[PDB]
């Protein structure tokens, strides 16, 4: 945003223009997939799930 806000022209930008949500959605997806904490949920009885 601060790389974009200074560079582009004033009285033409809008919050849709300044905001790139792609790092946010990529960050959540790379947490949920591919982290050592978001585990494949082990269930072969209810107790192992619990």
């Amino acid at each position: 945003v601060r790389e974009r806000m200074t560079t582009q022209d004033v009285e033409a930008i809008t919050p849709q223009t300044l905001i790139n949500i792609r790092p946010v959605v990529a960050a959540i997806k790379e947490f949920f997939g591919t982290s050592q904490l978001s585990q494949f949920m082990d269930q072969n009885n209810p107790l192992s799930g619990l």
């Binding site: 022209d9 009285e11 033409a12 809008t14 919050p15 849709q16």
Partner: protein, 159 residues
């Protein structure tokens, strides 16, 4: 001069409906803001009426501006700088000026050029945005029928 229910043109977001005159005082001064929304990105803009013309809010134009930009749209001998990036920067500044005649010049130039050649994706998106805001102003000026304004726009473009 701005009142509730008016229709006004805000640069560079085309048409704009005012909603109310916001009496939010701040810094000890009665900042008479006015909540003013567009239809493109659904963004509500509040500008104070003191510097509304300083930011360059502008009322819609009637039949004189209509046939004026029809004449400028019909105006032949459209010339351009030969460098395409100079051309693009020129029409970009003309579009960012927000003047309706400059918008008409830009859309008639880009329509005359891709109507002759078929230009670009960047020039295509340029023409799309400029045609969108000019169609919005012409739907405000003819007070109705954005699709009919589109059709009569494509009619007068062929002349």
């Amino acid at each position: 001069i701005f009142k509730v229910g008016d229709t006004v043109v805000y640069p560079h977001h085309g048409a704009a409906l005012v909603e109310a005159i916001e009496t939010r005082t701040i810094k000890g001064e009665q900042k008479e803001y006015l909540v003013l929304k567009v239809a493109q990105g659904d963004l509500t803009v509040r500008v104070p009426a003191e510097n509304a013309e300083y930011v360059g809010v502008r009322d819609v134009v009637g039949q004189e501006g209509l046939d004026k930009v029809f004449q400028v749209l019909r105006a032949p001998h459209t010339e351009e700088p030969t460098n395409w990036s100079r051309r693009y920067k020129a029409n970009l500044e003309k579009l960012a000026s927000g003047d309706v005649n400059k918008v008409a010049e830009v859309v008639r130039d880009l329509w005359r050029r891709d109507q002759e050649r078929g230009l670009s994706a960047g020039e295509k998106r340029m023409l799309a945005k400029a045609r969108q805001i000019l169609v919005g102003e012409l739907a405000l000026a003819e007070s109705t029928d954005d699709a009919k304004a589109e059709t009569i726009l494509d009619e007068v473009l062929a002349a």
